[PDB]
Paper text:
Domains 3 and 4 form the 120 Å long 14-stranded β-barrel, with each protomer contributing two antiparallel β-strands. Four distinct constriction rings, two at each end of the pore, were identified from the structures and confirmed by MD simulation.
In addition, we also solve some key mutants that are regularly used in nanopore experiments, namely, [name] and [name]/[name]. Also other mutants, such as [name]-[name], R220A, and T240R, have shown improved sensing capabilities by modifying one of the two constriction sites of the pore. In conclusion, we report high-resolution structures of WT [name] along with its [name] and [name]-[name] mutants in SMALPs, amphipols, and LMNG.
Numbering used by the authors:
A (entry chain B): 1 to 12, 25 to 422
B (entry chain A): 160 to 422
The structure:
Amino acid sequence: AEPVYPDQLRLFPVNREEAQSVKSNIVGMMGQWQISGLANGWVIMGPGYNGEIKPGTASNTWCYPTNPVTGEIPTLSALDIPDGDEVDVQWRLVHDSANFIKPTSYLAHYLGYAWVGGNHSQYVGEDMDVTRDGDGWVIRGNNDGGCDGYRCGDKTAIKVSNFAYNLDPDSFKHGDVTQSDRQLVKTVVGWAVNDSDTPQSGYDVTLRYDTATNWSKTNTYGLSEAVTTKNAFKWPLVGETELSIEIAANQSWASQNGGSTTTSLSQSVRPTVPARSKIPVKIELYKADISYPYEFKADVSYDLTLSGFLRWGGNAWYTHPDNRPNWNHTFVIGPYKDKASSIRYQWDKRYIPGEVKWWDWNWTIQQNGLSTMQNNLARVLRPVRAGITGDFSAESQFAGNIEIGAPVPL
Amino acid sequence: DGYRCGDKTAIKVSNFAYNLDPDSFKHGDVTQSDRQLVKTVVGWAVNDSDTPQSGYDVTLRYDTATNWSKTNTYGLSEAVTTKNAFKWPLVGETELSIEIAANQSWASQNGGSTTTSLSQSVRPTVPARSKIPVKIELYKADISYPYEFKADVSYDLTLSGFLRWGGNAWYTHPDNRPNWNHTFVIGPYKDKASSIRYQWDKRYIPGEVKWWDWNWTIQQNGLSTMQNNLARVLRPVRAGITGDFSAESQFAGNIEIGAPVPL
């Protein structure tokens, strides 16, 4: 009837359906050949009995506490970054030890990654090096000197990339738009003549320009069969001659695929002309490179990737491998995009065994405690806000011009 | 007197661009020459009702296009033949041959196109119990007109030469005196490799130093010297411009609404 979170269970109320809904977690938390009651004559049996639930009696009963608590991840206040360009904000973000470096290192440590730290300290998240690599950043423990341990030279690597911005609607501005390397496409001029006694607005001149590309591929197969007969006869005047007859047949099959993409652009002018007058018009089209600056305020999200090998003594992956494999996983720190990359979705769905496909958070709660994981995940998912300035540029764009001239009396 | 003193460094200026003041642009008379007719149309709009009517339309459109494509094909073929000889009644000795064959083929294609179009319409309003004539014409002609404006001037700056053996500012610091070319854009931002300001501002990030090492220049000459030199280099320029426009084989049109005639 009600969802049961395994971290709230207590062997002092528990329905048979509730016990069956969360079965593997309850079986794993009891000793082998242990028998404890549930409710209304039902009891649950431990390992060695294959977790069978059968009618019985017992004085030791599982019991969900009268008033359990909600285990949601808390929401913290936003972190403010000093204003600058996109790269300055990223640099300021990835160099904060107390707000960024420690929580992510602790998250990697809690999930079972190995050697999250440098050689000059004994604690997680200490002696970490930050480097700029391509469009992202890499954070890894310092590897200078020596270390003592099995594969202590294989430090876990944390990578940050794909930064996105959620703008405030009323903050965006942009400056002057400038053009360079202009090339003419086509122009048109014309006149609109009105010789009636009333104003007229039924005029139209339109210029359009299109470009396109296409591709295709084809495969063909076939067969052929032929029979030939040859003989020789003597015919009058022709004398000896050779006569040959051939009959053939063939079959063929073909298959094709393709595609295309078209780009278009048009300009129109529709002037209103006074009575007994005329008006000139002109339309131009160009190709040019465009540039302009901008500024805004937004919220910053990014992708978080953890790379390393999982500890032999225990890790949080749902299959619990024990051969120290190399692992990669990506989280999206921000709005929901997918189930495999959402921490909140996996955390909220930990009461359904069939939804546990990537990480086992109940194992982490057992290992470290509920409040520790809650605070760590709250610090990890803290919102970030900053002011941004930047520059836009693009090559081979379109530029147009439409003009309506002054009227000339007739 | 010097090692390769005859190889002087060359400075080149090109690609001038203008940022106009919005309220300064003007142009003069537009003139046409070498006019060639395309197509014309005339017509009448008749209104025999008791109210004014505006539901009329005449439209003329002209289109041109080009296209291209390329194709590659490959294939294989296998055949087996058997030949024998037999004696058959009346036919006597004869030769019988049987052949069986198979083939395969693969193909790939690419292409593209570009279309140019232009149209003219007239939609007159006709009074009750009257008629109105219309006419539309299309021409090809060469166009010319003068103009003037005020703008800001930007350009591309290119340096060509070889780098000194005793030390240079390139981030790999070569020492074999190679020939070098590099282009700066003196004006609005277009790219990272050609922006002095972006490279100067990002000198505190070692991973962003990919073209020039400005910290080396600051060590060699001092902060204020480089600041003043770069400030003088990037000074804005303004001027007034007059010019002439011309183009060949453009479009020229004409649309007319005539006077009403009572019915």
